[PDB]
Design an enzyme around this catalytic site. Sequence first.
Site, PDB file in Angstrom:
ATOM      1  N   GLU A 106       0.809  -1.228   0.000  1.00  0.00           N
ATOM      2  CA  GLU A 106       0.000   0.000   0.000  1.00  0.00           C
ATOM      3  C   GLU A 106       0.849   1.287   0.000  1.00  0.00           C
ATOM      4  OE1 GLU A 106      -2.027   1.161   4.073  1.00  0.00           O
ATOM      5  OE2 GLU A 106      -2.367  -0.999   3.803  1.00  0.00           O
TER       6      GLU A 106
ATOM      7  N   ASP B 229       8.833   7.868  -9.808  1.00  0.00           N
ATOM      8  CA  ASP B 229       8.876   7.104  -8.560  1.00  0.00           C
ATOM      9  C   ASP B 229       9.810   5.894  -8.693  1.00  0.00           C
ATOM     10  OD1 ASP B 229       8.384   6.584  -5.859  1.00  0.00           O
ATOM     11  OD2 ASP B 229       6.304   5.852  -6.160  1.00  0.00           O
TER      12      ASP B 229
HETATM   13  C1  LIG Z   1       5.982 -13.299  -2.748  1.00  0.00           C
HETATM   14  N1  LIG Z   1       5.501 -11.926  -2.939  1.00  0.00           N
HETATM   15  C2  LIG Z   1       4.959 -11.412  -4.109  1.00  0.00           C
HETATM   16  C3  LIG Z   1       4.645 -10.080  -3.828  1.00  0.00           C
HETATM   17  C4  LIG Z   1       4.102  -9.097  -4.729  1.00  0.00           C
HETATM   18  C5  LIG Z   1       3.627  -9.470  -5.970  1.00  0.00           C
HETATM   19  N2  LIG Z   1       3.078  -8.470  -6.765  1.00  0.00           N
HETATM   20  N3  LIG Z   1       2.526  -8.623  -7.996  1.00  0.00           N
HETATM   21  C6  LIG Z   1       2.063  -7.374  -8.331  1.00  0.00           C
HETATM   22  C7  LIG Z   1       2.331  -6.426  -7.312  1.00  0.00           C
HETATM   23  C8  LIG Z   1       2.994  -7.134  -6.306  1.00  0.00           C
HETATM   24  C9  LIG Z   1       3.567  -6.846  -5.027  1.00  0.00           C
HETATM   25  C10 LIG Z   1       3.607  -5.485  -4.552  1.00  0.00           C
HETATM   26  C11 LIG Z   1       4.021  -5.091  -3.235  1.00  0.00           C
HETATM   27  N4  LIG Z   1       4.048  -3.744  -3.130  1.00  0.00           N
HETATM   28  N5  LIG Z   1       3.624  -3.274  -4.354  1.00  0.00           N
HETATM   29  C12 LIG Z   1       3.695  -1.845  -4.645  1.00  0.00           C
HETATM   30  C13 LIG Z   1       5.013  -1.491  -5.332  1.00  0.00           C
HETATM   31  C14 LIG Z   1       5.111  -2.133  -6.626  1.00  0.00           C
HETATM   32  N6  LIG Z   1       5.214  -2.635  -7.662  1.00  0.00           N
HETATM   33  C15 LIG Z   1       2.441  -1.250  -5.356  1.00  0.00           C
HETATM   34  N7  LIG Z   1       2.315  -0.237  -4.239  1.00  0.00           N
HETATM   35  C16 LIG Z   1       1.003  -0.193  -3.575  1.00  0.00           C
HETATM   36  C17 LIG Z   1       0.104   0.781  -4.406  1.00  0.00           C
HETATM   37  F1  LIG Z   1       0.440   2.071  -4.289  1.00  0.00           F
HETATM   38  F2  LIG Z   1       0.085   0.531  -5.723  1.00  0.00           F
HETATM   39  F3  LIG Z   1      -1.178   0.720  -4.017  1.00  0.00           F
HETATM   40  C18 LIG Z   1       3.385  -0.928  -3.421  1.00  0.00           C
HETATM   41  C19 LIG Z   1       3.361  -4.306  -5.251  1.00  0.00           C
HETATM   42  N8  LIG Z   1       4.101  -7.786  -4.251  1.00  0.00           N
HETATM   43  C20 LIG Z   1       5.024  -9.863  -2.465  1.00  0.00           C
HETATM   44  N9  LIG Z   1       5.545 -11.000  -1.932  1.00  0.00           N
END
Ligand SMILES: Cn1cc(-c2cn3nccc3c(-c3cnn(C4(CC#N)CN(CC(F)(F)F)C4)c3)n2)cn1
Length: 283
Positions: free
Chosen positions: A17, A128
């Site tokens: 988030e 960003d």
């Molecule tokens: C094992 N494992 C897989 C994941 C995983 C998989 N995916 N597949 C798509 C997106 C993600 C993400 C992920 C985590 N953080 N994000 C963001 C930053 C970026 N890319 C978007 N940002 C949130 C907002 F602003 F879009 F709302 C933070 C995205 N984490 C985490 N642990």
Amino acid sequence: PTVFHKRYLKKIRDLGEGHFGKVSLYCYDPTNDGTGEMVAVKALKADAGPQHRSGWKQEIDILRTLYHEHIIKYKGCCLQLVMEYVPLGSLRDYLPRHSIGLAQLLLFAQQICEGMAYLHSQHYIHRDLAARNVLLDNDRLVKIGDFGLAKAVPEGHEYYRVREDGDSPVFWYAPECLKEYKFYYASDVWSFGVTLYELLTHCDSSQSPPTKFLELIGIAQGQMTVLRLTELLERGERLPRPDKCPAEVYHLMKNCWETEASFRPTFENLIPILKTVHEKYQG
Ligand SMILES: Cn1cc(-c2cn3nccc3c(-c3cnn(C4(CC#N)CN(CC(F)(F)F)C4)c3)n2)cn1
């Protein structure tokens, strides 16, 4: 253009988030059997204002028209943004937990440039570019995962005029962003330089850009954290050389951090250079 039906979207866990955004993992199971495809769904938090709400459709249309092997795949809408699930997550969460070799880091560095060069060729600035917005597909595949701040550069201009916000990533920004509030394609290069620093430090929190710049600025500067950051940057102060990072890689970081924007390499310039440096450390 693809329409995902809300009833088939079964939430699994929250992935990440931002200030006004949230990304969650979902199983899109119209049946209930093993075929259920794993999707990442991005939605706007309740607190979001009408500025960020109006720029959300614009975000969805940016990812809609970006097709690149190092850019996260757009799937559709339900507004909520449906994308592919990038299995190993952000480099920021991954690197402090998995000791990755220099060669692999340089390879990730190169792929970020190809995706960035492609993005720039489509006349978009990222604004960003940080390790937290780069997702890991496998130990040899990386993707630019978020475009929350991305903007089209207006046709007759060489920069975007930025509207000084609270959620702006100032420790990843070049002085022209912090002082003149202009975002050039060369401003993303400054941020890449920062991202490369992050990769080379394995995204260790004690060595992070905010940690390092605040040790230099001081934590009691009133409304003057940005101003003091600008003046240390204009004095030619930079982040230190990450331990174990090659001298030449550091000079390439420092060259992405030229105070003069025009003296910085473009993303196109960086690709042949990073390919060679990678090849060198691959042996
Ligand atoms: C094992 N494992 C897989 C994941 C995983 C998989 N995916 N597949 C798509 C997106 C993600 C993400 C992920 C985590 N953080 N994000 C963001 C930053 C970026 N890319 C978007 N940002 C949130 C907002 F602003 F879009 F709302 C933070 C995205 N984490 C985490 N642990």
